[PDB]
Ligand binder design. Structure first.
Ligand SMILES: CS(=O)(=O)c1ccc(C(=O)Nc2cccc(-c3cn4ccnc4c(Nc4ccc(C(=O)N5CCOCC5)cc4)n3)c2)cc1
Length: 265
């Protein structure tokens, strides 16, 4: 089943820290590259995550960071996933050396859209979609990471709408004002993620604070067109930010729009 034996793990180098503590690069069964999130005690609702990692092991898609398993008969617990050699998309976007063509940026958006369309087909929310939660493999393929792990974060700064680490800049109004989470809230975050990609990793609303961002969007104002985005590309991302949640497209619609732009441009 889902349970990896920790004897089958070697820890090689440190990849970074995030919400649940350290993440290490390693080998699984002396052959397979893996990332290993070592879960900082106190950071996670471990029993709920364990009980729900089963559902998560059934989420398998070409554009989702593949879960390989868990080590849960120990503390701290580990979570083993597919290794993504090119690391965080946000950093990737930020290195001027890649000198991306707009076609490669759109492929990045398509990668994430495929993953999210699959998630939507399973009626499973990400809740924290953003470039910082996307990874890049050795072939330049973008995959969506840590989908659904937000529910097991014990830090109130991250989970409360008013917390200092809440993804205010990726959230629709109805999340900020009413904690109304839905497939349409992931759609909103998706459009902001496209803006992140087309602006080569800028902070959304770069000149605003979080509070200023919430007022801006409640006044009905949105992110400006990144220079690199064509009118077609802007229309896609802007469609994700309709004030009425029910007028935002599905990931299935967004996918067919992205493929069309690819064909057209
Ligand atoms: C703000 S900053 O200092 O530029 C900065 C911000 C974030 C990171 C970062 O990698 N964070 C992070 C946090 C949790 C999990 C993960 C993380 C999770 N993963 C799941 C699957 N694969 C990965 C993966 N792959 C990586 C990450 C980083 C590198 C890398 O080249 N590094 C350079 C040398 O030092 C180690 C990293 C290589 C592969 N990184 C990544 C590194 C630097």
């Amino acid at each position: 089943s889902w349970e990896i034996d920790p004897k089958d793990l070697t820890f090689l180098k440190e990849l970074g820290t995030g919400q649940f503590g350290v993440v290490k690069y390693g080998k699984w069964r002396g052959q397979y590259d893996v990332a290993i999130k070592m879960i900082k005690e106190g950071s996670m609702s471990e029993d709920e995550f364990i009980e729900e990692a089963k559902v998560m092991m059934n989420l398998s898609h070409e554009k989702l960071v593949q879960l390989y398993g868990v080590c849960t008969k120990q503390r701290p617990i580990f979570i083993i996933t597919e290794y993504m050699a090119n690391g965080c998309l946000l950093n990737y976007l930020r290195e001027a050396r890649h000198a991306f063509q707009t076609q490669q940026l759109l492929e990045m958006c398509k990668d994430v859209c495929e993953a999210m369309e699959y998630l939507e087909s399973k009626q499973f929310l990400h809740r924290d979609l953003a470039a910082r939660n996307c990874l890049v493999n050795d072939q330049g393929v973008v995959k969506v990471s840590d989908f659904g792990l937000s529910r097991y974060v014990l830090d109130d700064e991250y989970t409360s709408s008013v917390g200092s680490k809440f993804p205010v800049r990726w959230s629709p109004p109805e999340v900020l004002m009413y904690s109304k989470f839905s497939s349409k809230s992931d759609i909103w975050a998706f459009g902001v993620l496209m803006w992140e990609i087309y602006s080569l990793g800028k902070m959304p609303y770069e000149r605003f604070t979080n509070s200023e961002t919430a007022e801006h969007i409640a006044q009905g104002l949105r992110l400006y067109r990144p220079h690199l985005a064509s009118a077609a590309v802007y229309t896609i991302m802007y469609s994700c930010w309709h004030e009425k949640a029910d007028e935002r497209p599905t990931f299935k619609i967004l996918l067919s729009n992205i493929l069309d732009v690819m064909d057209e441009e």
